[PDB]
Structures are given as structure tokens and as C-alpha cells.
Design a protein around this nucleic acid. Structure first.
Lengths: 126, 82, 153, 100, 98, 126, 208
RNA sequence: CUGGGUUUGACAUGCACAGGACGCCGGCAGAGAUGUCGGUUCCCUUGUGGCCUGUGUGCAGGUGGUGCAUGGCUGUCGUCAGCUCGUGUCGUGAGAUGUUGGGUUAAGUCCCGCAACGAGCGCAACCCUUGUCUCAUGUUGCCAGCACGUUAUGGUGGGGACUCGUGAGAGACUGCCGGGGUCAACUCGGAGGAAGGUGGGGAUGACGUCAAGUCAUCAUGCCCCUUAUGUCCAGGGCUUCACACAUGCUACAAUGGCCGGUACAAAGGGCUGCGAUGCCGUGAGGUGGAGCGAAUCCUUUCAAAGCCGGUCUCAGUUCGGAUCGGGGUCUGCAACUCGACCCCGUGAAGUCGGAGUCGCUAGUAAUCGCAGAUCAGCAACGCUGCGGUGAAUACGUUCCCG
């Protein structure tokens, strides 16, 4: 078998791809019981759409960490990596779409003296 | 307020003082220093000279103020206005 | 912006309508990051418009945008130590941004008891050319024309 | 801070170990169960007769050398001023400046 | 019967040195090992104010990091035990024998 | 104008004198004054030749005006603070009479930073 | 607050901790007895230049290693000094406390000893320029020293105005992490107040 | 602050005279400090040592004054790019040059010129964290392939496969290509790549300035108190309120309130501490104590915003929660002045806020929850961190500030 991982701002996704139908198994729940947001589903299935291999791979995924959006992003990177492992010669199509790039955007560390990462306390001149 | 299991709190000094005060049915002014002591139904007639921070103010107990503290009846800060 | 222009964010096409402009609309109506509620509001408004008119919602939404899209807008200019209202040509992107912002706000001040109905009514009246955003475009064009004397600088 | 107050803190600690260890703890065990006859026992009154300094509620974590009563750290028993100075000098094992 | 050998040290190289030297000696005595299984590093963080007076906005952060290694043997022949209590280690590293 | 004075230590009568002297500056200010604060302090060291320090802060319609002086007693410090505040308010005026000499004049005579640049044709004059 | 302490900057990279032990429940009392030991050794010995004091602990036995420029002064030929320090370290509730007296190979290359000597000269009668120049020359005469900076501030010369003065020779890269800067601070006792002397000595770099 | 005590003193160390007790354990008086009464009484070894007594005597003791006498520590201009030195040269001299000119950069960064030639502190780099991969690695962590499971699940035997944990290493160097460039710095675009041009964020703050802050962390010169400005105790105060200023939280609602169901985090803490199952309350909580010095157990298996369903229908309201009345819980010797939380009732202002003004350029602002330090309890809506969802805009330096 083949197994890859996807990571998106503290969300880790392990994916197991087999050549069955378009059944989506996310920790024993389907793509509708999970991810009840159409934008998330489109973000999930975009690599399949640009590779046109929709509904020819049974997908088993392990999800932990982060929230629904981070999980969806990490899952999309996971399917991109699995596809690049299955059929190498499609790398142009996925890469120019950006699906092969890990997103290095993380929560900025809170800084002392500031209420938030960049928000500064209100200052009164008078 | 204080929990019910512990019961009301009264200092031992004025406790023994009022027990020896009511044993002969005569109630003279008692000079006290524990503002934290609760009013017990044994004080109904006794007159307390409770501390204030500067002096002692006479407090004559009634049935109404039972269950409170001697401290509520000795107002500490003095304010007359601006 | 002292060292040059900054790159623009390439927001994605909408899944259930396939148009850039509906995504721009949902980002305009977005508040506090509640994106799901914003998309629900926008989709409900579009479906209400489709039900009322009976045709595609994207075409009537585009018609509303062209009805409220401005072309001439006035900015204060300080030339030779003096400030005046100078009419200025508006780039297409800024005209679209202004049109969407006007639509969203003027829908927020409607009286249809719910944001979805307010938005649907505002887009419909802009499509027919009766909305308050259309009016606002009329006044901004009027102000641009009335100050045409200062167009030379 | 003041030598007298540094000393008095220690005197409270030796008082605590002498009294709060069993005297000021068995009375609490008496008062805990409503089934236990506290009212006639006067475990409240008996525990009032004990010195106030028996109670740990009167204790104060001061700096172990400096006597500083505020900005204390329980891991080191040291003031924030002293921890900063000794960590910088490499005196507390396995302590260094942070980055992340 | 197997016994757990637990290492905790503030310095990585020290605890790694002790772990390798301990597996060396137990292998000398002829015992089966599992290897120095790594364990999560414990991080204790403290934030302090730089200045003695005021200036709260300027803070300084410190941590103390504790590294843990796990050693488990088998076949506890007495020679390995007698070797185990006859080992000299750096004072930084402690050993827990269970 | 209303002024609040935050003195310290021993300065009898300094608060009233400072109040009455500073409150007379409202007419000099060309914009409404939103806030006006004065602080009087004295140096503990007798070696200081001018121990008394007076500071003022006025919010002239969002523009902050402040001054600080030193004197041998409260009266002299307050008077010097009044003088400095008057000078600052004179330099802040910003109404038309205060900026009529700085507006660029003439057509070709004189140049300033904000002077209107000369219009140039495409072809060299020749 | 301009410069952080150089020892603390490189505590995990170049320099090493001066106390080596591990404690989980008994961290607090270990620290207490350590600082008591350090202060007692500080007040007890001042003639011989005390450059560093290390403390090692293992259960009952406590091992204290100190470096001096004059070991003979701090050690008794019959053990009288050793007897005194041993007894008054037993008095510190250290259980078995055991000592290694040591001697530094190059006294003039050690920042703490240089600062101690400069401050001792400053205390009695010496002008500060003489002290700084002599220390700088003596330090650069050593082979491994690549750069020294000497600075003391206060009421120099008994004047009424505090002043800050410093001379440097060679390279003192305080911002370079791998560079080892030996840092020494010691306060000069004068009749007009207290003068604090800081010494930075740079001797190459250590790459691990 | 009021009042009550005490003086080689609350606490040190040294000189003396007298000792065998100091010290505790209980009683009484007192608000307590304290005083008094009852019981127990040193080991050395003949010289006295440890204890204290008093008598004393040096002395202790001061959060008493001066941060314009200071050390140390810190803020600030400002993470701005600048500040200097040696030799040489010019000038009677203060001084100048170098450090200026052209170009370039985030940078006194670099290149070309140049009476300057070099150097130092600054810039940058070396350090941490984060984004990719390789090797090692299997417990308390994973579980893909195998077996046992019973509803309760990696729960259990087992397995390195994938995560993950933590060690080592590789990887970004204008390395390559094309074009501008003095063929120089440098710059624009492209390929490869996880990442492209100091990748993101930290730590790091030059000479100095502002007699900036701190004799209340500490130390310290000088002055002052010393039957008191030292020291012990009880009560009170630091919480006082006609107002003014400043930082925040909660709102003024339908992008919402309430009810029910339901899904996803990170980080951190825990021994006289975390504390589970269970039982009792409506709820704070009570009883009880499993297991845990903890990748194991507990903080619930961890969240809230989110999604689904129902209801409310634009009102000072099913908004808002202040204030007030009653009843309780917990901590603590003790919640009156003056704690937090829980229940029932009460239901104020408030309809988006004048002049003016603040923060923020991307995982940022906005919004949501979680944790820690201090800590018996808490005034925490504060501070320090952690993750969830996640925008708009930048045409361009005329104006405002530095």
C-alpha cells in the first residue's frame, strides 16, 4: 500500500488510498457526516478535479489536531501527495495548482507588552 | 455568611462575660473588643461598648439585631460631606 | 506602500455558483470571521432573487453591479498649498469594490426584518435601478460633474 | 527586607510544624463529618484557643535569602530579582533564556 | 522478570552518554536490551520582569528542559545486577531502577 | 477653562495661583481646550538652586501643548510656565493669520516645498 | 539596561553551569544551601583571589571545588584552614562535605581575578588610569588573550560627579555567540563610596 | 492611624559577674502582646565550653532623608544606522579629512572614485523556534497487515508500516538560466524545490541623551533617631466619594437570545497536590476515595465559536445585565468594615455614542474558548502563553507625526 501525510497549522492527516470507488472514510465517518461545509468539500476534492481521477480511489484518512478548516487543508495536501506517489507523471498539473506546497502559516506567538500578536494597548497622549 | 455546620461565632471573652453577667440578672455596660462576634439571643438586654478604632460606642441589643455582628453597629469611617 | 504596490490576494471561485463576484460578496458581508453564516446569507439572498425573478441569480446580480458601479469619484487634492475636490477616474477593481460595499451596507440599513431578505430586495431594486445604492451612485456622479472645473489637476 | 520580619516568618514555620501537624488538623477532622458531634465537643472553641501562628494561613513565602515578600517563585524559593541574576550566572541547573 | 531503568537529565549529551554506557555494560554482562527509547521532553516555562521597579512591559522568559530515556532489560542474571549497582555516572543524570 | 492641579509635598497656595494664572490662557488658544493639567513638584535636595518644577499639558482640540520650567518658589515657576505656554500657543496658532506668510505666493518669483510646479510642454521650448 | 550578562548569554552554548546536581523535591533547599555556601566562602576568603566556586551534590556527600590564584593562603599546612572550612561546612548541614582546592593556570587571563586586582588597587590610593593600563597590558601579554576591555564607573578619584571610563584592546565581539567572553565584575570599596569594575576578556572561540 | 507593652531590644557577635537550667507542657488573667501559677530538668570535666537569666558594656536596629553623592538593575530615542580611534595630510586654532561624490542595499551593506591608509563598537552571521526530507527510534506514543476482544473503546496479545515523540544529518547558497546593468555592486523575470532572494517569528539594543526611574529587591557615602523615626500586639486603614482623567469588560441585539442534539485543538499543571467511578443535592457543592511524581492517572473521554432542529418576531423586548431583598456553599482562627461562587426574586442606564482620538498589512485585524504564575481563598474583566474560525485594503508620498 501507500501512505502519505498532510499538515496544516497543527492539523495532521494520515491518508490511505486504495483504487476502489469514491467512498470517503474519515475516521469511520463519511464526507457528509464529517466536513458539513461545501467549501471544505470543494477544497478536499480540488486535486481530484484537476487530475480528473474523481470516483476511482477509496480513501481512508486519520484526522487529529486543529479544526475543521485545518483538517481539510491538511487532508487536501495528503491526497495531493498520495496522487503524486501513485501516478508520478501528473506533477505539473498538481504543482502549478499549488497543491504540492505545505502552507507555512502558523499562529504567531503572543508578545509581552501587546494584547495580541500584533495588537498594541491603547495609548493616550492627553 | 458563615457556614451553618460551624455554627455562629462568638469570642470566648465576651461569652464568659455575658454568662457571668446574666447569672445574677443584672446588666451593666460591657466593654468589648471583638467586633467579629455574632449577636446571640443571650445578649437581648445587655449593653455593649463595642470598639470603633478610636473609642467605644454603646450598643443596646434588641430582638431585631440578633444574628448580626457587633461590628455593624459601630460605624468606623466618619463622613460629613464636601 | 512607500516602496511600491503590494500583491493582491487571489481569492477562489465559488463552488455552487462558479463566479468570482459572489465570493467577493461573501467576503464583503463577512463579520468576525463567521464565514459559514456569511455564505448562508449570500446563498439565501441569491435563491430569493432567483425565486422572485425566475431566472439565474448571477446575471441579475451582475446587472445590479453595473447599475451601481461608479465611474467618476472625487478625491481631495492638495496642489500648490490648496485643497479642492478633484473628480478622478475610477479603476475597474475599485469600482467593483465600491459597488459591493454600497450594496452590502445599504442592505444592512434596510427594514426587511432579516439580512437575507434585505440583501435580496436591495439586489433586486439595484437590478431594476431603484435601490439606495443606485441613488448613491447618482449623487457621487453628480458631485464629480459639479466639480469638473478642477479636473485639470 | 527587615531582619525582624525575616526571622518572624521562620518562627511561624516552627510554630506551624509543632502545632498544625496534629493539633490544628484533628479538630478539622472532627468538624468535617456532620455525623461527628462537633457542637458539644467545642472543637471550634478548642481550636480557637490555639495560637493564631499555628495556622498556616498566616505564612508568607519570602525569598529564601533576600526576604522579598512579592514576586516569589515556588520552584526555586527565590525572588524574581534573584532568579534573573543567578540564572544569568549559570547557578540554577538546566535554566537558560527562552526562544520559540 | 524485567525491571525498568529510567533516566532523567537536564543535558542531552549527558543522558545519551549514560544511556549508551549502560547498554554497553549490560551487553557486557550478557543481557537483552530494547534500546534507549526516547520519551517526551518536559518543559517548564517561567516569565519574569527584567527591572526591579515598574517596567512591566519588558519581560524575560526561561525554561528548564528535562530529557527522559527508557531502558528495559531481560533475563536478570545476578552479574548484570551487580554490575548495575557498580556504575559511576555524572551527577547531572539520575537513574530510577524499578 | 477648568484646570486640575496635581501638586505634591508642601506647596501652600501654589495650586490656587497656578489655577488662576493658567486659566487665563484660554482666550489665547485659538481652538477650544479639551483638557488642561498642571503638576507641581519640589526637589528634596537642598543643593538644587531651582528646586520647584512645574509642568503643564493642554489639549488644544487634539493638539498637545506642554511645557516645563524650574524656579526657586511656586510663584516664579508658575509665572515662567505661563510664559512658556503662551509662547507655545503662539507658535501653534495654525489659523489663517498664522499661515498666510507661508502659503506660496507670486507665479514664478520665490520657491517653496509646496509651490505649484511649473507646467512644461512636451517639446523643448527652443 | 544595555548589555546582558555574557555568561548567561552563552550558558547553554559555550559556558557551563557552576552547580551540577539534580533535584525534584529538594530543589529549593539545595538552592538555599548552595547560596549559603557561596556567601560563606565569599566572606571567609578575600586575600586569595577567588575566581570561581563549583558545587556538586550526590545524596549525602557534597563536593565543592573552588579556584584560587593563591591556594597556599586558603589551605593550612597542618590543615588549620582546611579544618576550619570543613567544620563550618559541616555546620551548614551539608552532611558529608568534601573539598578540592585548585589553582588557576593563568591568573592574568581570568577576568574575575583581573577585576579583583584592579579594584584592590583602586581602593587604597591608585589612580584608575594606572590600574586599567596595567591590567590591560598584563592581560594582552598572555598568549591566549585576543582582546580585553576594562571598565569601572562611580565617583572615580573621590570626585563628586560619577563617571564611566573604559579602554579596549583587540577584539571584543560581545554579540558573537560562539566567542567565549570571560566576564568579571567586582566592587571596589573606597572611602567616598563604591566603585564597580567590569572586565571583558576575549580568547578565541569554541566550536562544538 | 488609635490604644496597649518593651527596651543590649524582635534579631546578631564580642568582653565581664553569678549559675544549673534554658527550654517546654498545662491553669488562670488579659483583646493580645504579656504576666503569674503547677510539673520536667543539661551534657563537657575541673578548666570550663554550649543556654539563658539579669546586671551590664561595645553594639544591634531604621520600608528615616538625600536616585542632583553613588554602585547595580531598567526605560527611552531605537533594532534607528550610526558613534569613534591609530598613522598620515590641511589649518595659528577650535577643528577638518577618512565618514564626502556617483550607484546600490533593510543597513557606514557593498562597488567605483577620492589625501587618505587601516582599525574598533555597531549592521549581517554564529543561537532558539517554525515550514520539507533522510537515517536511528518503539513506551506510557501509533496501529497498516494478523489474532483475542464486548460493547467501552488500541481495550487486549502482537507489529515500524503511517503519525508522533527526540537524537544525528541533508536542505537556499542569487546555487542555475535569461535580461538590465561600468561587466561592478545590485536589480527584474524563469526553472527546480517544502521553502527564493536577510523564508516567518524570537533572543541579541553601538557611543551616548533625558542629573529619566529605583536609597522601598539589594548594596552604599554623608546626615538624622536610639527609652525612639527601633520592636511586639489588638482593632482600624490602604476598599473612604460632589467630581475629573486613563486602561479594560459587558451591552445596546435577529450576522441575535433561549432550548435540545452533535464535531473538531494546542499548550500547560499536579504529593500532604491533581483528584476519577459511585452516592446525596437543583447548584455552588457534600461523602468517598480508584489511579497518578505522572506520553500511563486526574485536569473529564478535554473546548467554545461551528453544524442541525425548535422557538422567539423588531419591543427598552425571551435584548441588556447593573442595583437591591431573601436563602445558601467553600476557604480561612475570623468573610461587618472587606472574598468568590450558587438558588429564587428584583430588572437601572443603554436605540451604536460630539469635538477629538487609537490599533492593525496575513494566518494579521476581528471573534471564540483553554492553560499558567501569584495563590488557604479570591477583587483575574488584569498579565503571560496556547490553539479554533478567519477578512478588507494599500492608487501614491502633497499634507499630519517621528
Amino acid at each position: 500500500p501507500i501512505q502519505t501525510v498532510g499538515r496544516r497549522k497543527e492539523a495532521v492527516v494520515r491518508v490511505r488510498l486504495v483504487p476502489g470507488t469514491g467512498q470517503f472514510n474519515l475516521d469511520g465517518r463519511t464526507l457528509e457526516n464529517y466536513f458539513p461545509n461545501k467549501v471544505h468539500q470543494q477544497l478536499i476534492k480540488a486535486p481530484l478535479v484537476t487530475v480528473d481521477r474523481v470516483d476511482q480511489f477509496d480513501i481512508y484518512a486519520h484526522l487529529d489536531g486543529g479544526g475543521p478548516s485545518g483538517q481539510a487543508g491538511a487532508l487536501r495536501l495528503a491526497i495531493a501527495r498520495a496522487l503524486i506517489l501513485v501516478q508520478p507523471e501528473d506533477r505539473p498539473a498538481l504543482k502549478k495548482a499549488g497543491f504540492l506546497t505545505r502552507d507555512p502559516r502558523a499562529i504567531e506567538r503572543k508578545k509581552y507588552g501587546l494584547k495580541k500578536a500584533r495588537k498594541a494597548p491603547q495609548y493616550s497622549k492627553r | 455568611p458563615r457556614s451553618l455546620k460551624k455554627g455562629p461565632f462568638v469570642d470566648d471573652h465576651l461569652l464568659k462575660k455575658v454568662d457571668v453577667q446574666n447569672e445574677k440578672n443584672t446588666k451593666q455596660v460591657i466593654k468589648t473588643w471583638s467586633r467579629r462576634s455574632t449577636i446571640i439571643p443571650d445578649f437581648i438586654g445587655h449593653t455593649f461598648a463595642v470598639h470603633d478604632g478610636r473609642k467605644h460606642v454603646p450598643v443596646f441589643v434588641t430582638e431585631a439585631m440578633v444574628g448580626h455582628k457587633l461590628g455593624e453597629f459601630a460605624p468606623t469611617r466618619t463622613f460629613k460631606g464636601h | 506602500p512607500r516602496k511600491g504596490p503590494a500583491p493582491k490576494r487571489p481569492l477562489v471561485n465559488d463552488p455552487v455558483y462558479g463566479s468570482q463576484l459572489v465570493t467577493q460578496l461573501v467576503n464583503k458581508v463577512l463579520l468576525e470571521g463567521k464565514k459559514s453564516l456569511a455564505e448562508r446569507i449570500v446563498y439565501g439572498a441569491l435563491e430569493q432573487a432567483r425565486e422572485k425573478t425566475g431566472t439565474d441569480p448571477v446575471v441579475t446580480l451582475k446587472r445590479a453591479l453595473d447599475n451601481v458601479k461608479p465611474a467618476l469619484e472625487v478625491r481631495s487634492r492638495r496642489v500648490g498649498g490648496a485643497t479642492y475636490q478633484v473628480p478622478v477616474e475610477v479603476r475597474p477593481d475599485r469600482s467593483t469594490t465600491l459597488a459591493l460595499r454600497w450594496l452590502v451596507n445599504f442592505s444592512r440599513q434596510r427594514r426587511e426584518k432579516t439580512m437575507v431578505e434585505r440583501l435580496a430586495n436591495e439586489i433586486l431594486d439595484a437590478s431594476n435601478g431603484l435601490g439606495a445604492s443606485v441613488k448613491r451612485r447618482e449623487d457621487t456622479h453628480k458631485m464629480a460633474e459639479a466639480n469638473r472645473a478642477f479636473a485639470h489637476y | 527586607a527587615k531582619k525582624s520580619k525575616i526571622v518572624k516568618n521562620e518562627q511561624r514555620r516552627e510554630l506551624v510544624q509543632r502545632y498544625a501537624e496534629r493539633r490544628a488538623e484533628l479538630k478539622r477532622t472532627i468538624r468535617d463529618p456532620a455525623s461527628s458531634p462537633e457542637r458539644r465537643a467545642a472543637a471550634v472553641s478548642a481550636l480557637q484557643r490555639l495560637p493564631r501562628d499555628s495556622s498556616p494561613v498566616r505564612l508568607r513565602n519570602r525569598d529564601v535569602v533576600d526576604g522579598r515578600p512579592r514576586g516569589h517563585l515556588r520552584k526555586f524559593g527565590l525572588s524574581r530579582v534573584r532568579v534573573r541574576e543567578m540564572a544569568h550566572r549559570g547557578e540554577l541547573p538546566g535554566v537558560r533564556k527562552a526562544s520559540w | 522478570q524485567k525491571i525498568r531503568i529510567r533516566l532523567k537529565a537536564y543535558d542531552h549529551e549527558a543522558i545519551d552518554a549514560s544511556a549508551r554506557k549502560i547498554v554497553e555494560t549490560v551487553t557486557r554482562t550478557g543481557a537483552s536490551v530494547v534500546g534507549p527509547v526516547p520519551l517526551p521532553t518536559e518543559k517548564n516555562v517561567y516569565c519574569v520582569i527584567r527591572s526591579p521597579h515598574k517596567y512591566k512591559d519588558s519581560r524575560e522568559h526561561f525554561e528548564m528542559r528535562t530529557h527522559k530515556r527508557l531502558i528495559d532489560i531481560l533475563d536478570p542474571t545476578p552479574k548484570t545486577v551487580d554490575a548495575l549497582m557498580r556504575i559511576d555516572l555524572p551527577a547531572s543524570v539520575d537513574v530510577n531502577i524499578q | 477653562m477648568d484646570v486640575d492641579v496635581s501638586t505634591d509635598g508642601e506647596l501652600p497656595g501654589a495650586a490656587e495661583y497656578a489655577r488662576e494664572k493658567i486659566g487665563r490662557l484660554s482666550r489665547r488658544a485659538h481652538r477650544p481646550v479639551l483638557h488642561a493639567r498642571v503638576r507641581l513638584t519640589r526637589h528634596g535636595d537642598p543643593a538644587v538652586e531651582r528646586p520647584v518644577i512645574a509642568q503643564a499639558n493642554l489639549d488644544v482640540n487634539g493638539r498637545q501643548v506642554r511645557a516645563q520650567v524650574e524656579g526657586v518658589n511656586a510663584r516664579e515657576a508658575v509665572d515662567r510656565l505661563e510664559a512658556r505656554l503662551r509662547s507655545r500657543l503662539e507658535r501653534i496658532a495654525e489659523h489663517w493669520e498664522a499661515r498666510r506668510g507661508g502659503v506660496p505666493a507670486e507665479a514664478g518669483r520665490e520657491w517653496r516645498h509646496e509651490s505649484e510646479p511649473a507646467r512644461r510642454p512636451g517639446y523643448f521650448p527652443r | 539596561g544595555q548589555k546582558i550578562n555574557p555568561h548567561g548569554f552563552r550558558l547553554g552554548i559555550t559556558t557551563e553551569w557552576k552547580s551540577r546536581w539534580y533535584a525534584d523535591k529538594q530543589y529549593k533547599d539545595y538552592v538555599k544551601e548552595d547560596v549559603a555556601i557561596r556567601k560563606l566562602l565569599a566572606t571567609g576568603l578575600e586575600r586569595a583571589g577567588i575566581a570561581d566556586v563549583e558545587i556538586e551534590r550526590t545524596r549525602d556527600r557534597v563536593r565543592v571545588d573552588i579556584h584560587t590564584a593563591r591556594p597556599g593562603i586558603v589551605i593550612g599546612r597542618r590543615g588549620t584552614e582546611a579544618d576550619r572550612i570543613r567544620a563550618d561546612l559541616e555546620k551548614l548541614t551539608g552532611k558529608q562535605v568534601q573539598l578540592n582546592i585548585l589553582e588557576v593556570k593563568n591568573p592574568e587571563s581570568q577576568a574575575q581575578l583581573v577585576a579583583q586586582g584592579v579594584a584592590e588597587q583602586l581602593s587604597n590610593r591608585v589612580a584608575f588610569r594606572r590600574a586599567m593600563r596595567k591590567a590591560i597590558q598584563s592581560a594582552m601579554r598572555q598568549p591566549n588573550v585576543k582582546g580585553i576591555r576594562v571598565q569601572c564607573s562611580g565617583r572615580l578619584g573621590g570626585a563628586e560627579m560619577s563617571r564611566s571610563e573604559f579602554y579596549r584592546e583587540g577584539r571584543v565581539p560581545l554579540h558573537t555567540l560562539r566567542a567565549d567572553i570571560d566576564y568579571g565584575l567586582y566592587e571596589a570599596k573606597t572611602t567616598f563610596g563604591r566603585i564597580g569594575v567590569k572586565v571583558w576578556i576575549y580568547k578565541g572561540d569554541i566550536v562544538g
